[PDB]
Amino acid sequence: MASMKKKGSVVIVGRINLSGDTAYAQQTRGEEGCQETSQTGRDKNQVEGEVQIVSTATQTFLATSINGVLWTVYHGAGTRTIASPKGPVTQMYTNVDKDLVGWQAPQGSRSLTPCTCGSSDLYLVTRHADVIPVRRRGDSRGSLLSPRPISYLKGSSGGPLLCPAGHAVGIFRAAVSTRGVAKAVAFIPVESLETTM
Numbered sequence: 001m002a003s004m005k006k007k008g009s010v011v012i013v014g015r016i017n018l019s020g021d022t023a024y025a026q027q028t029r030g031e032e033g034c035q036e037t038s039q040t041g042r043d044k045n046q047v048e049g050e051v052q053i054v055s056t057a058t059q060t061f062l063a064t065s066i067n068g069v070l071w072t073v074y075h076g077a078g079t080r081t082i083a084s085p086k087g088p089v090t091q092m093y094t095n096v097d098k099d100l101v102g103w104q105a106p107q108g109s110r111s112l113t114p115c116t117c118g119s120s121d122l123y124l125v126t127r128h129a130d131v132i133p134v135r136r137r138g139d140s141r142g143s144l145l146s147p148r149p150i151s152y153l154k155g156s157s158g159g160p161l162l163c164p165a166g167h168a169v170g171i172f173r174a175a176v177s178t179r180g181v182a183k184a185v186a187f188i189p190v191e192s193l194e195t196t197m
């Protein structure tokens with residue numbers, strides 16, 4: 001009982017910059033700072049952008065702000081708090097049935113707008129700042145126009161699927177793997193987010 005440890009907070013360690021004409025990943029915190037911040041839950045770094053790169057002590061993935069909520073996957077964050085300037089912040093959404101969690105969007109972040117376009121021509125943003133065209137195939141699935149090994153998608157859960165106009169259509173959740181090649185992806189649709197809200 002005196003032995004019991006507590007899990008650290010999720011920590012923002014970077015972002016995917018979609019500011020200009022060229023998407024690129026930026027790192028804002030190194031490994032050691034990440035571990036220190038995960039234990040204290042005190043993150044004093046300025047936050048910017050819509051797509052954050054986040055890490056725990058053992059995993060790294062993405063988190064996306066939509067409608068003032070920073071969304072990510074349960075299989076990445078579990079029930080963890082997220083580090084913030086005033087300490088660990090408790091999740092305001094947790095749905096294991098959707099593989100979905102969410103915190104209040106960090107101060108200084110920018111939120112994506114939920115898509116109302118009804119378009120099936122989507123774009124998946126990875127942690128390496130790749131913008132991958134994806135054709136919507138269902139309420140929660142889409143196919144990569146150019147399949148590639150799952151290695152290229154690993155670590156991008158929690159990243160956004162965007163419509164042509166830049167609206168949020170869903171949160172990247174899983175890849176459908178066929179002999180190691182990712183031909184389709186599964187995502188949490190924004191409407192499922194808007195419902196949980």
Ligand SMILES: CC[C@H](C)[C@H](NC(C)=O)C(=O)N[C@H]1CCCCC/C=C\[C@@H]2C[C@@]2(C(=O)NS(=O)(=O)C2(C)CC2)NC(=O)[C@@H]2C[C@@H](Oc3nc4cc(OC)ccc4nc3C)CN2C1=O
Binds near residue numbers: 075173176
């Ligand atoms: C829908 C399932 C489908 C039928 C697939 N079948 C086949 C044959 O392909 C199929 O299983 N695919 C898998 C191939 C993996 C190989 C790598 C894939 C690469 C990128 C992928 C986007 C990524 C990702 O990047 N994670 S991550 O960021 O690296 C990480 C681990 C740090 C966080 N998601 C990803 O890895 C997921 C995680 C697992 O899925 C779920 N866990 C949970 C857990 C929960 O509580 C514990 C509650 C709900 C839940 N719901 C899921 C759907 C396995 N995942 C696959 O994608």
Ligand SMILES: [Zn+2]
Binds near residue numbers: 163164166
């Ligand atoms: Zn749209």
